[PDB]
């Protein structure tokens, strides 16, 4: 037997950082959960009880905190690139570092209509994430995403013209609820190293903002023929607005809201044009995926 | 043996309702999770296999949806009062109805700076809740709350002067992080029935808004001596602003963010005035409670 | 305004303890999550920023670990009584200690049919809990429970003869699935102090074992007329087997499994006597409660 | 722009099935959660609002229940192969079906030392899973796994000889706690179709049992040099016991239990040989992975 694949490291590392402007008094906070997994010439730790090749996961944890102390933690694409680069440069025998960062929201409070200098609210469980793979001799591969963006529209969603056979019970509809939890990922052109990542730094926040804006506006405004058709429009627009993206991926649950026929009770009309009260379904759920690239 | 207490009903009933203004096209959505538990002359269902006294939980579910179809679902204090009153009026042998409602956020989207007529975002997992106890001959007892309001301030929190003995390791501090998940409850004067509840309807949304506003502003602005001292200020202000409240209760975790001494690594200074990177602690957590009333 | 109620302390304190028999080599592990909340002459911490009355929650945490080091952690009723007694004895101004313990399962592994001396499996997420309220001048009040015991029977559950009116759609049944998550609590006679608790120590494990045995056997063997009728039988049996219990409480969800009519597809018969494939319903769920005492 | 990848279907489909032996009265229950995602000539549903190519996810749900009615649901490898094969055979334009099944435990109760004919306990949240990818022209690729198997050993775990540099604070140890949640996957030789899968049916339950047995015994008996070294031994043993497996993958968190120095309190000794009370750490956690194949 032989080791065909191996990686190891520290997961679920919670990190907070504060920036304090002593001149203005304005403080800004960042909170993340970080995972770093390493690959390299580590097989003997598995096959021969050779711990000499192991950079302890505890040490990886320490390194995450040290790197956050010595560098900006934003944008997460940059921080993850710095962190991953560190491991492959510091340790000859480590040849890849896989850095996942989940960024938690701490939005500055407005109090009596003015932004507060040091108070924040978790205004959504929506996350901004990165997956930064630093692979020695193969640059830096970055996937950026937003996830946990939960939305609903109460009309201007349709679903008709789907295949009908002996397995089909679903009624066609021209007016339904659509709700989802958006998971949207944009995959960057490979970067050659940390200099090239740094050279594009403003594009990371800008592209995240674009992706979010396009997602919301397209969801709100598209009189949707299907989840498939709507999500494709989102992806093509994001690709058109950032040439350093190669692909955009969406993964969207269709979180069903079922009509409730109440006509058995005193002839109450609660379906079709009269539908007001619905049963949100926790499960099951449609799950619709696609990855869009350029032709 | 004998039945000393009993209640039963349907829990975890998800409910959506839409309102459609056909003139303007503006749609408004409401989503809840409802629990209704009944008490009454039901002991023989337990002791004698007498199901004749049981209003089936399935029927309670149906009734929740019917009541939502036939009545406003907002404010939740009103909806819960209507729903609870129904059971004690409809069924002679049912003498209490305990209605819990969790209201989920669906905040209208702004698209290109304009409110969208039918698209919504779950802008926070914060909930607005009610507990409405309709007890035959004893009116309607309502507890309103907000919960899951997660906040952090990066300075202007202190904790010194606490008891120090042989069990104490905690250092005094004059500048720390404070973060919590706010659970705040206001208990209304007993209402005699549904007419009296209806007579105060505007006060429910207004008092929720007050409670939220006071919580946020006091958290942001109080240079906090302790969680205890800050939460008391919140409660006393809410009591001063609504005379139909009898008590205000807060339950606040102290979600600790620990300094990380990095001085073992190249003399890095990350404590005290130099503290920038912290370790959020998932557990354990302080838990601080109080109920404030009028003197 | 004035403080009508207050308590505070440390929640979510994870604790592991090992016992090592150096003679035999057999090791035994215990794992808990502990919460201790204190009451007393603490109102000025809320009203006057008086921290002198606060035993820091950090110190309460330290005390939990010290007490676990210096005492048995089993049975949890005893450990909680020791821990609660400590606070009211050590601190003149503290007059109640509220101790909640959740015990996690670490069941010894059998390897090649022999119990292993130091290896364990989390064989269920079922918990054994206590709530120990030590109140100065009022002894020690203990509620013991088991929770998260998830069971299903595939027949020998019925539900017919329930009230039928204009809100009822549920069909009567003489053969259905019954599944629940058992939460069962037994409330002990008040104990005068720690000596009296200690004098009954063997009864704690014995009564937990009885409660579990009775729950399982009654669930399995009762051809159930309703959740109500079955749970009452469990409670009355437990009361008959331990005179130092005053009441037994059950809280049982009815975790519904719905038939699926497939007759629209090629006449497939999957209802009534032909029902084989069912749809487990995540929500909503019936919730059935009762507290049984002696007549 | 163009669709580079797409798949869609129904997720989170809960399924129960009962088998009833009318001769013996013994009933046996199965409960799963199923996901089926399809690929094929579906791009126009995304690009052109062409729903004609969509087999509705609702219909996929119906098909799961119909297939469970008409076929065995065990072993899950077989059920998933039947289900996946159905979609690629029934629909010309569908060319892959990706079937994930999570199997939930319903272990038969023993009551008064005898197996009960129709009562079951969720004896662990451990799962048995499959991932069955049926790809037209490319057979059936099956990955089988066990997950959520939570274990702890209180000694006979070591970790010393790891790399030490300026990022390292971790003390070497020759006696520590090791706890993990086992996720173990075995990847089968490609099968040509459903006949070949059926021809190996007994091997599925047998190999799952082997994997579980080896995991437990190796964990219990290996005086572990590291998670890496122990998990490799598990994988090599499983490969040696089933030649139709190509690889075995483990993913193991190192769920840390930290010593608590109590020497600040009355000289209490709770470290090293005197360590009895530990602090389980919820996060962060080491995460150790490897995939083992044959040389
Ligand atoms: O039943 C279905 N209903 C759906 N709606 C949709 O937009 N696309 C689908 O493919 C579908 O996803 O859930 N299938
Ligand atoms: O250690 C403590 N630190 C705290 N901070 C606080 O505001 N009050 C407390 O009572 C305390 O709550 O967590 N105890
Ligand atoms: O619809 C119902 N079905 C039930 N079954 C039951 O055992 N008791 C009830 O009161 C019931 O609880 O869920 N109500
Ligand atoms: O700090 C570490 N401690 C560990 N223990 C271990 O068995 N292997 C590691 O690589 C390690 O994983 O968590 N790193």
Domain ranges of chain B: 1-295
Among chain D residues, the shortest Cα distance to A224 is held by D49
Distance (Å) from the C-alpha of residue A76 to the closest C-alpha of chain B?
15
Q: CB burial class (10 A; 0-12, 13-18, 19+) of residue B16?
A: buried
B265 contacts in D (CB within 8 Å)? 166-167
On whether any CB of chain B is under 8 Å from the CB of A153, the answer is yes
Q: Give the atom of ligand 3 at the shortest distance from the alpha carbon of C286.
A: 13
Q: Is residue D231 lining ligand 4, measured as CB closer than 6 Å?
A: no
Q: Is there a cis peptide before residue B22, judged by omega within 30 degrees of 0? A: no
To the nearest 5 percent, what fractions of chain B are helix, strand and coil? 30, 40, 30
Give phi and psi for D111, each to the nearest 5: -120, 125
SS3 of residue A99 by DSSP:
strand
Strands A127-135 and B140-153: unpaired
3 state SS of D147: strand
The burial of B293, by beta-carbon neighbours within 10 Å (0-12 exposed, 13-18 middle, 19 or more buried), is given as middle
Contacts 24+ apart (CB under 8 A), C240-246: C241/C207, C241/C210, C241/C214, C242/C186, C242/C203, C242/C206, C242/C207, C242/C210, C244/C188, C244/C189, C244/C200, C244/C203, C244/C207, C245/C186, C245/C187, C245/C188, C245/C189, C245/C207, C246/C187, C246/C188, C246/C189, C246/C293, C246/C294
The answer to the question of whether C227 is labelled as a binding residue is yes
User: CA B159 to CA B152: how far, in whole Å?
Assistant: 16
Residue having the nearest C-alpha atom to atom 13 of ligand 4: D286
Q: Which residues contact D56 (CB under 8 A, 6 or more apart)?
A: A159, A162, A163, A168, A170
Residue B129's closest CA among B236, B19, B249?
B249
Pocket test for ligand 4, best of A12, A13, A54, A94 (most atoms within 8 A of CB): A54
Q: Is the CB of A6 under 6 A from ligand 4?
A: no
**Cβ contact, residue pair B166, D282, below 8 Å:** no
Q: Is residue B295 within 8 angstroms of chain C, CB to CB? A: yes
Atom of ligand 2 nearest to the CA of B286: 13
Q: How many CB pairs under 8 A join B and C?
A: 232
Residue A187 belongs to what H/E stretch? strand A178-188
A264-269 long-range contacts, Cβ below 8 Å, gap at least 24? Answer: A264/C169, A265/B62, A265/B66, A265/C166, A265/C167, A266/C166, A268/B66, A268/B69, A268/B70
Burial bucket for residue B125 (CB in 10 Å: 0-12, 13-18, 19+):
middle
Q: What is the dihedral of CA A110, A112, A113, A119, to 10 degrees?
A: -20
Half-sphere exposure (CA, 13 Å, Cβ side) for C38? 29
CATH code: domain D1-295 is 3.10.270.10
Q: D170 and D162 in contact (C-beta within 8 Å)?
A: yes
Of D14, D116, B51, give the one whose Cα is nearest residue C154. D116
Using the 8-state DSSP alphabet, how is residue A260 labeled? -
Q: Residues lining ligand 2, judged by CB closer than 6 Å? A: B 159, 170, 226-228, 254, 286, 288; C 8, 54, 56-58
Radius of gyration from C-alpha coordinates of chain C: 24
Using DSSP, state whether A20 is helix, strand or coil. strand
CA distance A137 to C272: 65
Residue with the smallest CA separation from ligand 4 atom 10 is A56
Entry resolution in angstroms?
1.3
Written as six digits, the tokens of B127 are 């909930």
Cα C160 to ligand 3 centroid, rounded to whole Å = 9
| Spatial separation of the C-alpha atoms in residues A291 and B5, rounded to whole Å | 57
CB A273 within 8 A of CB A237: no
Residues in contact with D218: Cβ distance below 8 Å, sequence separation at least 6, in sequence order: D230, D233, D234, D237
D253 touches chain A (CB under 8 A): yes
**Among candidates C99, C102, C68, C103, which has minimal Cα distance to C84?**
C99
Distances (CA, A) of A165 to A227, C28, C82: 21, 60, 69
C7 carries a ligand binding annotation: no
- SS3 of C255, please? coil
User: Per the structure block, which two tokens stand in for B64?
Assistant: 């929740």
Nearest by CB to residue D118, choosing from C111, C156, C262, is C156
- Name the 3-class secondary structure at B47: helix
Q: What is the largest CA-CA distance in chain B?
A: 78
How far, CA to CA in Å, does A69 sit from each of A128, B66, B226, B283, D200?
21, 58, 28, 23, 56
Q: Tell me if the bond preceding A284 is cis, omega within 30° of 0.
A: yes
Pick from B264, B282, B283: CB nearest D169 = B264
Pocket test for ligand 2, best of B286, B287, B289 (most atoms within 8 A of CB): B286
Buried/exposed code over C151-160 (b: 16+ C-beta within 10 A; e: otherwise): bbbbbbbbbe
Helix (H) / strand (E) containing C194? helix C194-199
Q: What is the DSSP letter of B193?
A: S
Q: Which of B106, B113, B86 is nearest to B16 (CA)?
A: B106
A286: CB partners within 8 A, 6+ apart: A227, A253, A254, A256, D8, D9, D10, D11, D57, D58
The span from the CA of A163 to the CA of D97, in Å, is: 17
Q: Any binding-site annotation on D191?
A: no
Contact in structure between C264 and A169 (CB atoms under 8 Å): yes
Q: What span, in angstroms and rounded, lies between the C-alpha atoms of A138 and C289?
A: 62
- In this structure, the dihedral spanned by the alpha carbons of residues D272, D273, D277 and D279, taken in order and rounded to 10 degrees, is 30
Q: Of the listed D28, D33, D44, D57, which one is catalytic? A: D57
| Residues B279/B258, Cβ–Cβ less than 8 Å | yes
What is the spatial distance between Cα C16 and Cα D154, in angstroms, rounded to a whole number? 10
- Which residues of chain B have a CB within 8 Å of the CB of D266? 166
The region, left, alpha or beta by phi > 0 then psi within -120 to 50, assigned to residue A142 is beta
Q: Does D268 touch chain A (CB under 8 A)?
A: no
Query: CB under 6 Å to ligand 3: residues?
Result: B 8, 54, 56-58; C 159, 170, 226-228, 254, 286, 288
Residue D92: how many CB atoms within 10 A of its CB? 10
Using DSSP, state whether C18 is helix, strand or coil: strand
Residues of C designated as active site:
10, 57, 256
Partner-chain contact B279 A156, CB within 8 Å = no
Q: Please choose, from the candidates B178, B195, B212, B163, the residue with its C-alpha nearest in 3D space to the C-alpha of residue B81.
A: B195
Q: For helices B201-221 and B76-90, give the axis angle rounded to 10 degrees.
A: 140
Shortest CA distance to A149 belongs to which of D99, B124, B162? B124
Cα-only R_g, chain B: 24
Give residue A57 CA to ligand 4 midpoint distance, Å.
Answer: 5
Cα separations (Å) of A83 from A70, A104, A192, A228? 11, 19, 15, 37
Q: Say if CB C293 and CB B11 are below 8 A apart.
A: no
Q: Which of B255, B77, B106 is nearest to B182 (CA)?
A: B255
Q: What is the DSSP letter of A190?
A: P
| C-beta atoms of C167 and A266 within 8 A | no
Query: Residues of B within the annotated binding site for O2?
Result: 57, 254
Angle at A185 between CA A181 and CA A191, to 5 degrees: 165
* Alpha carbon distance D131, D144 (integer Å): 7
Residues 6+ apart with CB under 8 A from B88: B94, B95, B96, B97, B134, B135, B136
DSSP type of residue D140: E
Identify whether the C-beta of residue D165 lies closer than 8 Å to the C-beta of residue A86.
no
CA distance A100 to A4: 23
Residue pair A78/A198 in contact by the 8 Å Cβ criterion: yes
Cite the annotated binding site of B for urate by residue number: 57-58, 159, 176, 227-228, 254
Pocket probe for ligand 1: among A156, A254, A256, A283, the residue whose CB has the most ligand atoms within 8 Å is A254
Q: Kindly state if the Cβ of A227 falls inside 6 Å of ligand 1.
A: yes
Identify the CA nearest to B151 among candidates A110, A29, A17, A121.
A121
State if residue D134 touches ligand 4 by the CB under 6 angstroms criterion: no
Chains with 3 or more CB pairs closer than 8 angstroms to A? B, C, D
CB contact (8 A) between residue B236 and residue C1: yes
Active site positions of A, annotated:
10, 57, 256
Which residue in A128, A169, A113, A109 sits closest to A33, CA to CA? A128
For helices D76-90 and D201-221, the axis angle rounded to 10 degrees is 140
Phi/psi at B78 (nearest 5 deg)? -70, -50
Distance of CA B199 to the CA centre of its chain: 23
The two tokens of residue B97 are 């109805």
Nearest to B58 among C8, C170, C283 (CB): C170
Q: Residue B20 has which token pair?
A: 């459609």
- A with C: how many residue pairs have Cβ under 8 Å apart? 11
C116 to chain B, closest Cα gap in Å: 31
């Amino acid at each position: 037997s032989a080791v065909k694949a191996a990686r190891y490291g520290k997961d679920n590392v919670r990190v907070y950082k504060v920036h304090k402007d002593e001149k203005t008094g304005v403080q800004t906070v960042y909170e993340m959960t970080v995972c770093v997994l390493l690959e390299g010439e580590i097989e003997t730790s598995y096959t021969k009880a050779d711990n000499s090749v192991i950079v302890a996961t505890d040490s990886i944890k320490n390194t995450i905190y040290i790197t956050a102390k010595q560098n900006p933690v934003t944008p997460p694409e940059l921080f993850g690139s710095i962190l991953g680069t560190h491991f492959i440069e510091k340790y000859n025998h480590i040849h890849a570092a896989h850095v996942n960062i989940v960024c938690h929201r701490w939005t500055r409070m407005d109090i009596d209509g003015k932004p507060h200098p040091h108070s924040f609210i978790r205004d959504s469980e929506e996350k901004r994430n990165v997956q930064v793979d630093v692979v020695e001799g193969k640059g830096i591969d970055i996937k950026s995403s937003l996830s946990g963006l939960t939305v609903l529209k109460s009309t201007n969603s349709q679903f008709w013209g789907f295949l009908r056979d002996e397995y089909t019970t679903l009624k066609e509809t021209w007016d339904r609820i659509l709700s989802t939890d958006v998971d949207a990922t944009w995959q960057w052109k490979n970067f050659s190293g940390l200099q090239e990542v740094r050279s594009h730094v403003p594009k990371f926040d800008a592209t995240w903002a674009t992706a979010r804006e396009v997602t919301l506006k397209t969801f709100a405004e598209d009189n949707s023929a299907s989840v498939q058709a709507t999500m494709y429009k989102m992806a093509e627009q994001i690709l058109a607005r950032q040439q350093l993206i190669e692909t955009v991926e969406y993964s969207l649950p269709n979180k069903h809201y079922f009509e409730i026929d109440l006509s058995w009770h005193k002839g109450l009309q609660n379906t079709g044009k009269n539908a007001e009260v619905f049963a949100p379904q926790s499960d099951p759920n449609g799950l619709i995926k696609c990855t869009v690239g350029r032709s």
